[PDB]
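Worked example 3. Consider a protein that binds N-phenylthioformamide.
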Amino acid sequence: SMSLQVNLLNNTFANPFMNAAGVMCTTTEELVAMTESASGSLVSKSCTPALREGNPTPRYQALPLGSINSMGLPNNGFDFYLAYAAEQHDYGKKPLFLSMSGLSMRENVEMCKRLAAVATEKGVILELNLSCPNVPGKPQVAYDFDAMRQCLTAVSEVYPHSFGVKMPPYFDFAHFDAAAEILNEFPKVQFITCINSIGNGLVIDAETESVVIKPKQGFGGLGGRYVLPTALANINAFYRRCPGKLIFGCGGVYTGEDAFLHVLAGASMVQVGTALQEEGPSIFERLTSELLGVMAKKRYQTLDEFRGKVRTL
Amino acid sequence: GSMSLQVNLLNNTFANPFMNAAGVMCTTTEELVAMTESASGSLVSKSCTPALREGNPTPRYQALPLGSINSMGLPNNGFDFYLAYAAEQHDYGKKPLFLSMSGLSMRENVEMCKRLAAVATEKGVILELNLSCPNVPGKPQVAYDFDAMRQCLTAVSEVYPHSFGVKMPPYFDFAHFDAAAEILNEFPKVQFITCINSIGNGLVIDAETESVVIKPKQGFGGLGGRYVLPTALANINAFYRRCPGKLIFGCGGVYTGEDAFLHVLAGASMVQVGTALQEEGPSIFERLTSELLGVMAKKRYQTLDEFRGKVRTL
Ligand SMILES: Cc1cc2nc3c(=O)[nH]c(=O)nc-3n(C[C@H](O)[C@H](O)[C@H](O)COP(=O)(O)O)c2cc1C
Ligand SMILES: Cc1cc2nc3c(=O)[nH]c(=O)nc-3n(C[C@H](O)[C@H](O)[C@H](O)COP(=O)(O)O)c2cc1C
Ligand SMILES: *C(=S)Nc1ccccc1
Ligand SMILES: *C(=S)Nc1ccccc1
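Given these inputs, the predicted complex is written out as structure tokens:
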């Protein structure tokens, strides 16, 4: 007898699967579809205080090995996602995460102050997106360790609940150490989601001799097959260095086997982006079946039996 | 129509843009000779330290469906060995030679460069300075530490009276492309930039064995091959745009003439081959020249200059 059950953050999840923030979670219809899917949870589109159009199109391209995008945070605005959490979401069906991506400290502070009551009353959980644009001349927030520390200090000061942080990938042990040191100073940070896209790749179409997306001269974040080893690295790096926190995996999941690798590396929840974009929410029925299949063949009954247990040489 | 893969840079003529990536098939005399006898336009010797180095425990390289992962740990025969090859053995009549240098401090690079100067003058060997190299404990690789990078280029420029190039890690943010380019532009002796070294510290897990696949560093290692092509193209183009006074050498994800075509369209002058060369051997250069000419014929190009850096934006 097997189970994909996950228990964390004072909640029970039927399985570890959910969407990645930004994928199929912007409209009411999408949020309802995610809730009615086989997924263990869902997260709403990263939001700004007001509605945002996002970047000019084309801004997403599916690729043989994944995807490239420069969406530009198109979203319905904080009021919309707050109202969904407060009044519409069926918590009977699964827990809900709300992704927040303000473009300044002030924006996140003011949204968090309002989110507090809804988290208390309804149980929505914050995923704070630190893999977000910074002021002119500076890199994305989590690549600016001072901006990151300031952000976590401000949110921790004003937001009376646990929360999690969505992180970009790092590529150097000194950066894994520096980022973990900062995260470990904030006890309210109870989960870390690794990873957002590999930033600023450039896809060129040999047939057209051109880039494939319009914003930023064709530069955009990579997802899909491209990012799996990077995702596993980050999941495991933070699993090791932040032992008091949970890790959520994100990046490169197309199959139950991929999800199995996320969990071996240390993941508690497993988020699905590019594959979900291409297949729709029916993917969750397939992924749960496949993960159970993998577990059956390997003689595992629960996720606890192998989470974080990747063997080193 | 008569077509040509010829490249002209740093007072040299290259028959075609292809060469090995530093670290791949270029450590021993036998490998260096094999690269010289190959159809490649050039070659670069294994990144060297002042003395020989064993490198990391094995397994330290693993080929993968989508590329490779490695943590080699700079195994190399030492600077004297590569200097002697450049000074006394290399057949410059066949093709130009690059020497990759990866000292582990400023002093190490300064002392090697002082000795390299005369051989560069007399024989024409060209330095590729590897700044995608380990730094002091607690610090990231040198090119991720902008002050250390600047200090390294100042130290080398002071003692090395020739042009050289720099091998760079990938960056992932426009603010970093800007910062890096600003530093590189300060050093006119840096006449080429090689983009990119591996995507650092990936982690491959074998689902069957439930384990990592390399021994050093808990299985973490640099990614090469198909995984890295869009990242390589991005870096090639980012520096092509930001460093107009320099040439860019592409490295990352090249398996076919079409891939090389993309490198050139992004801005590459030379095109280095790593993972694919490791898997196929130096015969790969015959295939790659043929394929690139084929791509050019079908697209109606006769020279590389006709499309270098001309990628269309929307
Ligand atoms: C079209 C698109 C929109 C996205 N929007 C968001 C977002 O709003 N917030 C966020 O944290 N990540 C966003 N992401 C990144 C994903 O959440 C995920 O980190 C990334 O795509 C890697 O997962 P994959 O390999 O499963 O695609 C987006 C990705 C895509 C492709
Ligand atoms: C086994 C191995 C050894 C390498 N050694 C070096 C080295 O000594 N110096 C260096 O600058 N890069 C080294 N690299 C990185 C390659 O030069 C190249 O940047 C990287 O492999 C990406 O190219 P590819 O996608 O063609 O493999 C090495 C890569 C591999 C796989
Ligand atoms: C931190 S809570 N928010 C922030 C700071 C700087 C840029 C964007 C967002
Ligand atoms: C720069 S020339 N060399 C250097 C400095 C610090 C660490 C490694 C190499």
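Take a moment to read the result before moving on. Chain A has two domains: 1-54+73-197+224-313, 55-72+198-223. Residues A 102-105, 108, 132, 134, 141, 147, 151, 154-155 surround N-phenylthioformamide (ligand 3) (CB under 6 Å).
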